[PDB]
Amino acid sequence: GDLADRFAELERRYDARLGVYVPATGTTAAIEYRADERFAFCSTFKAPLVAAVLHQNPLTHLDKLITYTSDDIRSISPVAQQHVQTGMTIGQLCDAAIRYSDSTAANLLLADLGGPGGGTAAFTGYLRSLGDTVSRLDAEEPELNRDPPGDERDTTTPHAIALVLQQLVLGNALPPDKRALLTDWMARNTTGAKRIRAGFPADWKVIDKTGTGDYGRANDIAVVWSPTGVPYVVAVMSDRAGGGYDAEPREALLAEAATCVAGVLA
Ligand SMILES: *C(=O)/C=C/N[C@@H](C(=O)O)C(C)(C)S(=O)O
Numbered sequence: 401g402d403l404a405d406r407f408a409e410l411e412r413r414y415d416a417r418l419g420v421y422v423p424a425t426g427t428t429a430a431i432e433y434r435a436d437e438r439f440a441f442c443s444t445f446k447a448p449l450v451a452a453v454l455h456q457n458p459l460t461h462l463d464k465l466i467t468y469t470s471d472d473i474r475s476i477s478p479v480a481q482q483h484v485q486t487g488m489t490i491g492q493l494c495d496a497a498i499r500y501s502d503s504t505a506a507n508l509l510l511a512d513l514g515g516p517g518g519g520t521a522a523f524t525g526y527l528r529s530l531g532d533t534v535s536r537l538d539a540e541e542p543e544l545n546r547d548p549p550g551d552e553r554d555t556t557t558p559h560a561i562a563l564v565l566q567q568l569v570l571g572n573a574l575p576p577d578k579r580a581l582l583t584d585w586m587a588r589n590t591t592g593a594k595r596i597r598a599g600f601p602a603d604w605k606v607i608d609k610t611g612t613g614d615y616g617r618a619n620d621i622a623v624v625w626s627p628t629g630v631p632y633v634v635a636v637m638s639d640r641a642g643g644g645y646d647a648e649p650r651e652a653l654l655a656e657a658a659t660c661v662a663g664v665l666a
Pocket residue numbers: 442443444475476501542545546610611612613614
């Protein structure tokens with residue numbers, strides 16, 4: 401059989417472009433499909449963004465209260481838009497940015513990193529520090545979701561983002577306590593039930609961060625644990641750019657790609 405043929409069939413059936421990377425392990429081959437092609441990050445950047453903030457600061461920094469106004473609310477901020485009066489701590493922002501894809505939380509965390517482009521250069525530099533020379537973040541939320549196809553701004557590749565997530569969750573890019581916090585936030589994500597999680601059987605643990613955007617963009621980056629506790633990183637990226645800027649993102653495409661991946665990792 402050829403798994404690449406089955407990913408090509410998903411592309412045909414969904415009128416989509418699919419990218420997949422599952423890093424090789426001591427026990428498994430890599431899975432790679434369009435893995436070095438660029439795809440918009442969309443909100444998947446929020447996971448390494450939280451890592452960047454954790455990396456740059458002592459854990460006491462999670463208790464720092466960030467204040468902001470209703471004018472700071474960006475598409476879409478399910479948690480921050482209910483705490484304009486109280487503010488939110490850096491830790492609460494990390495929680496919201498990963499678990500609810502909260503865009504104001506991510507923009508405040510970008511600002512916390514500092515520097516030109518409201519933290520986007522800093523974020524890109526953090527990925528460079530992890531050995532990623534391809535990915536780049538150029539815009540804040542929500543504009544980073546809306547670049548036209550072929551524009552390299554705000555893109556990564558499945559290969560790059562998978563190896564970033566590998567280093568962050570399974571590897572030693574972060575000290576183990578900071579790594580635990582990232583992992584726990586991804587483990588309690590609320591936005592991913594219909595994506596990678598939908599493709600892995602219920603006895604596999606799934607932690608993830610989604611992204612969605614223009615041109616039918618739908619992404620999910622996950623770490624999965626088998627029922628025997630063996631971890632894998634699964635990066636699935638998709639768009640439907642042939643359909644135009646308002647092409648519908650298709651979560652099912654990601655669930656079915658994940659099902660094909662689960663099939664070979666079983
Ligand atoms: C992270 O993936 C954020 C995505 N945001 C977009 C989405 O499709 O959910 C919008 C449409 C909220 S943003 O206005 O592009």
